[PDB]
Amino acid sequence: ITGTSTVGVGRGVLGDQKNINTTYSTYYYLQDNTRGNGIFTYDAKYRTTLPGSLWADADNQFFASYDAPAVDAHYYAGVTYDYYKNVHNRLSYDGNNAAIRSSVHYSQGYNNAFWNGSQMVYGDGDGQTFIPLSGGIDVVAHELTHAVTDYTAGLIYQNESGAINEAISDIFGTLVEFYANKNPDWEIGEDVYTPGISGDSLRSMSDPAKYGDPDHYSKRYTGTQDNGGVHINSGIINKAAYLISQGGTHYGVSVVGIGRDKLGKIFYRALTQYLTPTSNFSQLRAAAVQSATDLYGSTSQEVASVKQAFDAVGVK
Ligand SMILES: N[C@@H](CCCC[NH3+])C(=O)O
Ligand SMILES: [Ca+2]
Ligand SMILES: [Ca+2]
Ligand SMILES: [Ca+2]
Numbered sequence: 001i002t003g004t005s006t007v008g009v010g011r012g013v014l015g016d017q018k019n020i021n022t023t024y025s026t027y028y029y030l031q032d033n034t035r036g037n038g039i040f041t042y043d044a045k046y047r048t049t050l051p052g053s054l055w056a057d058a059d060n061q062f063f064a065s066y067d068a069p070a071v072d073a074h075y076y077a078g079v080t081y082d083y084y085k086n087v088h089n090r091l092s093y094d095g096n097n098a099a100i101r102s103s104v105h106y107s108q109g110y111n112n113a114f115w116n117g118s119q120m121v122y123g124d125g126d127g128q129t130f131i132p133l134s135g136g137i138d139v140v141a142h143e144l145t146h147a148v149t150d151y152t153a154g155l156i157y158q159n160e161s162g163a164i165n166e167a168i169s170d171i172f173g174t175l176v177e178f179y180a181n182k183n184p185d186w187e188i189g190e191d192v193y194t195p196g197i198s199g200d201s202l203r204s205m206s207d208p209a210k211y212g213d214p215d216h217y218s219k220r221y222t223g224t225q226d227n228g229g230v231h232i233n234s235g236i237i238n239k240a241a242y243l244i245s246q247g248g249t250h251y252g253v254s255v256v257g258i259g260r261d262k263l264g265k266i267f268y269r270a271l272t273q274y275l276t277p278t279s280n281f282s283q284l285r286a287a288a289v290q291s292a293t294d295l296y297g298s299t300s301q302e303v304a305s306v307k308q309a310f311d312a313v314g315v316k
């Protein structure tokens with residue numbers, strides 16, 4: 001909508017207060033005009049028809065329980081845009097400031113979120129397995145990173161290229177969580193998963209096997225479920241990325257860590273310059289080696305740590 005940019009206030013899914021960029025034209029809309037061609041948040045009204053209605057509010061205050069997922073989807077989309085722009089000099093998911101759209105209150109008791117090729121979609125959860133999924137910044141950045149992958153490498157969503165697709169979204173989800181510096185960790189979804197149970201999460205990057213996911217190529221899943229295990233075998237690449245950043249000894253192989261910033265630079269370059277739609281894990285290794293080489297030198301510690309990490313998880 002056309003109108004005047006302003007700033008509202010609301011409460012997110014976890015009860016924290018925050019300011020959000022809105023647009024005023026009779027109503028106050030969840031339209032952020034300060035970032036590219038805009039961040040737009042929609043109400044799907046418990047249906048599955050998308051996008052739904054642009055979120056409209058009478059007084060620019062968003063403290064109703066029904067508002068909370070909209071507040072976080074809108075706010076965390078902005079934070080993710082800021083991450084890509086300030087850290088990687090990328091303007092939105094397509095590199096030319098495409099509008100970012102999200103719908104919340106999708107369906108009833110829907111325990112998931114997703115990028116559908118054009119927009120983000122967030123369920124409310126059933127209140128036991130999940131609370132509303134936009135409450136997790138790593139979840140939002142995960143979904144939006146899918147859009148980045150779709151416009152760059154284009155990894156097909158099955159078998160090893162799908163696992164890489166998934167791992168990239170967990171990696172940049174986590175890096176966005178560290179960038180915002182709100183209780184950062186190497187777990188996925190801990191803020192919105194199982195409100196009854198502390199200390200757990202959907203997946204772990206530091207120790208994928210905590211929840212049954214492979215942490216070594218020899219344990220990869222070879223069946224047909226989950227599009228050939230795209231959310232399972234991602235654990236192999238997530239562990240590798242954890243090792244590159246933090247270091248550690250894994251199946252007898254020691255890796256010197258180089259830190260989060262360099263991890264991000266290497267995987268961003270690998271994604272945007274070297275990976276293709278059918279890249280497999282072995283091709284990812286070569287892309288990350290070449291990326292580190294480009295950035296730091298063939299004899300750098302950085303190239304050495306990338307090699308050590310993939311050796312540790314058994315990717316040749
Ligand atoms: N997002 C992943 C894991 C969450 C599962 C939620 N029930 C998937 O769809 O497989
Ligand atoms: Ca903001
Ligand atoms: Ca209001
Ligand atoms: Ca966290």
Ligand SMILES: [Ca+2]
Pocket residue numbers: 138174177184185186187188189190
């Ligand atoms: Ca996390």
Ligand SMILES: [Ca+2]
Pocket residue numbers: 190192193194195196197198199200201
């Ligand atoms: Ca929990």
Ligand SMILES: [Zn+2]
Pocket residue numbers: 142143146166169
């Ligand atoms: Zn995903």
